[PDB]
Symmetry: C3
Subunit: 486 residues, 3 copies
């Protein structure tokens, strides 16, 4: 007859690290790092994104002859663009303030194209010869579909003076361009006026431009250039145009309502018809964990990016007729702490749910607190700087590197500390049980020093159950123990 105190053990082989030891085996463990994704593009909060395929924002807006597929998108949440678009600008040139326009057009609540100036509004100018071989369409020269290129008619170029009243209830996006010739002979052949100018004016815009005739290298077989501009028109504002040559008039305008912000996404993966909350260039994330290591660039409410490859929290016990000093019992299955009973009546294991419940609740509460004490908010990450803005890009890189280092260090140190804290908490609990059963039986038995007590007298199964309950009668067997001694 003897009674011993031990702890649960199993065949688990999971390993964790503490501040002082490394590769400590535990019975149970939990991971708090996310490392998986679905590998597809899916909707953000029920709003389908916009996919431009092989086109670009400028080509889509200006109406490139090879990018007319996209004509119906009521709204979108973010824009997906290929890293190296093929069809961007058939005619060589540039667009002013491209990056700001892209950032503004990132997220649009409502989008619709309307016609503001019919082609019949130019009786004294030719509107059918404005084509070039640099913009082929089905093997024939063509031009942008959203603008019209005006040339002289009957060897005359009368001055142009028109204005537009905005009568719609939303803002309008308008684009126009100017063409640079190559030499004086070409300028005379195209516009008949050696000197030309363009004047554009609104309630807040005041612009005046002149052509720049010079010699330039060939791009796409053309030496000329075209520069385009854009503006936003108020609901009750008006815009006035005036020019006498080298003018590319607008034909279509876009009705735009903006009530949010986002960024532009560079990826090559395909659509997947899902709904998600966080999006990455290589897939989507559906995890509640506070840390991840998938990709730096993310859109939406996402966990924090860290460098570490493993963050495991220890939740179980230290894996390994005896006692708690030697090791953990394998015969016990229910509970974490308990007693192994043994006498002439029988043998077996009995668990102590009172402390096991407290330990389980404490561990679960710690894990839940660590997971849920993190605050997240909507964010958009991307690269939105051109060649001549390297300093700001370097500053942003400093931002990201510093934040990454801070988060990595904090997470690693927190995990390393908490593992050891949990282990010593378990040791304290088992020792508390051991001296709880102590100080009650008194001198009726002796402690072998291995975590067990050998009763001098005979303690029945009811007596042992009462001992487990915490109620024991010492004078009942005091005399039996006394004459048992020696």
């Amino acid at each position: 007859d003897q009674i011993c105190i031990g702890y649960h053990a199993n065949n688990s082989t999971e390993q964790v690290d503490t501040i002082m030891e490394k590769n400590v085996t535990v019975t149970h463990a939990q991971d708090i790092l996310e490392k998986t994704h679905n590998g597809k593009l899916c909707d953000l909060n029920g709003v389908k994104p916009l996919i431009l395929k092989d086109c670009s924002v400028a080509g889509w807006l200006l109406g490139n002859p090879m990018c007319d597929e996209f004509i119906r998108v009521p709204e979108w949440s973010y824009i997906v663009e290929r890293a190296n678009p093929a069809n961007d600008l058939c005619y060589p040139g540039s667009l002013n303030d491209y990056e700001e326009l892209k950032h503004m057009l990132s997220r649009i609540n409502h989008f619709e194209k309307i016609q503001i100036i019919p082609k019949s509004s130019w009786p004294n100018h030719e509107t059918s010869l404005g084509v070039s071989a640099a913009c082929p369409y089905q093997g024939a020269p063509s031009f942008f579909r959203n603008v019209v290129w005006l040339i002289k008619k009957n060897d005359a170029y009368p001055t142009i003076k028109i204005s537009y009243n905005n009568t719609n209830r939303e803002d309008l996006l308008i684009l126009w361009g100017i063409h640079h010739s190559n030499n004086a002979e070409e300028q005379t052949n195209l516009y008949k006026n050696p000197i030309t100018y363009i004047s554009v004016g609104t309630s807040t815009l005041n612009q005046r431009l002149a052509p720049k005739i010079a010699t330039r290298s060939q791009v796409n077989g053309q030496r000329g250039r075209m520069d385009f501009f854009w503006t936003i028109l108020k609901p009750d504002d008006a815009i006035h145009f005036e020019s006498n040559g080298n003018f590319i008039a607008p034909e279509y305008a876009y009705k735009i309502v903006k009530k949010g912000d986002s960024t532009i996404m560079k990826s090559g993966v395909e659509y997947g018809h899902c709904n998600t909350k966080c999006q990455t260039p290589v897939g989507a994330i559906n995890s509640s964990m506070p840390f991840h290591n998938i990709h730096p660039l993310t859109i939406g409410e996402c966990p924090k990016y860290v460098k570490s490859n493993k963050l495991v929290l220890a939740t179980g016990l230290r894996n390994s007729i005896a006692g708690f000093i030697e090791g953990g019992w394998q015969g016990m299955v229910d509970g974490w702490y308990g007693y192994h009973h043994s006498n002439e009546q029988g043998s077996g294991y009995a668990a102590d749910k009172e402390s096991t419940q407290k330990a389980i609740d404490g561990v679960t509460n710690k894990v839940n607190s660590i997971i849920d004490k993190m605050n997240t908010q909507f964010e958009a990450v991307g690269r939105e700087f051109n060649n001549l803005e390297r300093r700001i890009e370097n500053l942003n890189k400093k931002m990201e590197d510093g934040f990454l280092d801070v988060w990595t260090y904090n997470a690693e140190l927190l995990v390393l500390m908490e593992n050891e804290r949990t282990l010593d908490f378990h040791d304290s609990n088992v020792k508390n049980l051991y001296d709880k059963v102590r100080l009650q039986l008194r001198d009726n038995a002796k402690e072998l020093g291995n975590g067990c007590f050998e009763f001098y007298h005979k303690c029945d199964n009811e007596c042992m159950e009462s001992v487990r309950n915490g109620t024991y009668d010492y004078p009942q067997y005091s005399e039996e123990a006394r004459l048992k001694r020696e």
Copy 2:
């Protein structure tokens, strides 16, 4: 005859949360979050801020007729401006590099207005006709008070050549502008010359401008525009002007001395005859606490911004014929740990001074270290970007959000873990007292197991005080205890 060990208890109801349990009840607690403000604008380190009421910086500088009376306030620390100023640029137009001037005019010492070019310096030009209905004054047309609008005289407009030494010992701020006409007839009516230009040159400035004549939408009944410029003149530099029309000449200049930097606050709160160290748009704060949740935008030496609503540290014990493991003692005032005594003379309470003093010192040191290990620096937070710089604004927002998240997470985790440690720090000392008295007692008494010892022999008040002091004589009562043992 028995001696028992216990701890303090009271009628408190404060609650604190640990890493394992939520709102256990404690006797005493302290808050380390600031949530109060006076709701008024105070001076910053004894320096009056600048309040523009219903004006704007450009309107105040240029001298809008309905806006400014006179300068006052030779020095200031920061500028308070309303969200939507009413009087600003009565004549439609714009000011070049407005944001840079706004930022540079934040904190200024010895700001004084002087006159450089008297109106008598224009004998061949008209100076009393430059008025417009767009800037009325007491029901009559007027103009800006700091500049002069020049008109042709006797149907002529001779060329203007003027230069100015800066003989003063401080930097000088000068402003000028150019006017855009509407048509050729209006240009001829205002100035004889049909083609005009403006040339401005200093040791580091080289500018040449020409008017732009076009059709624009009317604002405030005027279709014209005026653009203004500014520059800083060195203490021994000179500035040269040259124009032949469409020239707005300066009349007054400001002597400026700058050392430091601040920002501009958008608020509507009134002044309160106050002196603070940290200022917010909704009020002023002074405190020593490391964290606050009042307003994201702050100026001065302010605590860190967090999102949490409650941050409470525990500085006491766990609240709830007795013993250690029963609960607290309501009846024993004046102490944290102590002994309850009961002999045949009577019963009462006594406290251990040394352990209580040590615990109080430790808790106070912990709280003071947590509060005082924080480093504070002067900072100015505000929004200083226009509509065409959205990317930098997004970068600043990412800045602020990341810092807020880091601080919130760190503060919450630290508070929880320190509460955990402090809550069970006291149990070690109480256990130490218990086994200390048990060690001195040895086997002269019997342990009831609830935290007391039943004395076999008689222990008078002198003996009881000796036991508390730590001077017990085992051989004195050993024989009596042996006889009583049977």
Copy 3:
């Protein structure tokens, strides 16, 4: 006759601070803050930096006459420049996009100067009179050595048209400028053309410029101005020039290959002929500690910057023949951390326990090594490159630096204090464990004096004492002896 427990103590006077106490004396301690530097400028990863001495970047590129140090360094890691260079621009003027060019002129893999337009290519223009007193050389007027100032010849200025087709296999850097006159008479005397223009065009460049004639202040005795421009030419592109006056044609071009990125250091320290890994304007840092307080501006893989002056991590014992619960100043034990002091008729000695000491030292070493090693360090170049009209971005960067500094300082100090508190308990727990292990083996054969010793009733000699240290004790052997000794 008795056995006692204690711990090692010595004569060290190191002091550490915990969360609850201050001025705590410890036996051993280790610092994790770096505060020393060699005070020299040394190479970065075997690549010698570029030292410009008293010449600025613009003067070095344009070929200032007073910067005759035409030493060739094919590859450099970073640029060292004085705070206030003296020889910058002999002729007053400005350089467009100066800051971007300076940023791009950081670490360069390959650099070489070649001639693209010989002076013989101007038969109808004068190329020998383009000198000024503002650029002296050995007491004579001179000009920049990389550009040519063209003047009218035979009272005529024919229009200039030229192109250059890039046959090299690397990118090319080209610079050109335009001169502003003072009045109509000077313009007529210099170029004979009242109205002039400059046209430059490449596959991606389209620029047109016109002179601005006005009255300006006198700088270096000259009232004129000169504005310069730069561009990058692709390996198979060409550049076309066209002007009729006020033109400064290029003569030499730079052939450049760029791979990485760096910044510019402002310092006055001398060269040191080293090979370091982290650089600082006041010296070089050679250390593995995670924190330092030398200088905010650094280049390369460097530790974090904090405002603290001391960061000491406790790794020893509480410094101050009975011990265990009274002062454990056992100066006799000099061979371990925990042990026993024994005494009987044969003699006395200070034995030590190897297992507990090994466990404690392994744990402390693992803690210190983990704290030191769990640092992520990446290459970062920190500088201050912003002009007078970009103060807002500079303020943003300053806020960045201040916030990061505050976060790191607070975290480091709190971690150090808390870890010292944690470490100052493990030793006491080990001592207590050893004490109870010593107990429950003698049971009732000895009297626990409570001062930290046990006094055996029976007679135990050196062999029995060694056995009880070994963990093997024969209780029944001396049970009857303890019984008869008990009164």
